[PDB]
Design a protein around this nucleic acid. Sequence first.
DNA 1: GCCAACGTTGGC
DNA 2: GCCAACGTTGGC
Length: 44
Amino acid sequence: KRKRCGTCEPCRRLENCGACTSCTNRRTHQICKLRKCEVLKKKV
DNA sequence: GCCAACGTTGGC
DNA sequence: GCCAACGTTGGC
Ligand SMILES: [Zn+2]
Ligand SMILES: [Zn+2]
């Protein structure tokens, strides 16, 4: 697993949105879509 | 042991 | 080609 960059706009966000697939569907095991690190959205 | 969330992949 | 679902790690 890679680590989030910590400094992109999504990484800086503190709150989960509550409304995306991640936030409403905890079965996904994903971070809030608005918080997903821009670096991690690119495949290795 | 809990909890958050990354990597993979099957289903579309 | 995308992404929801699952298995898994890794910080604590
Ligand atoms: Zn969200
Ligand atoms: Zn980031």
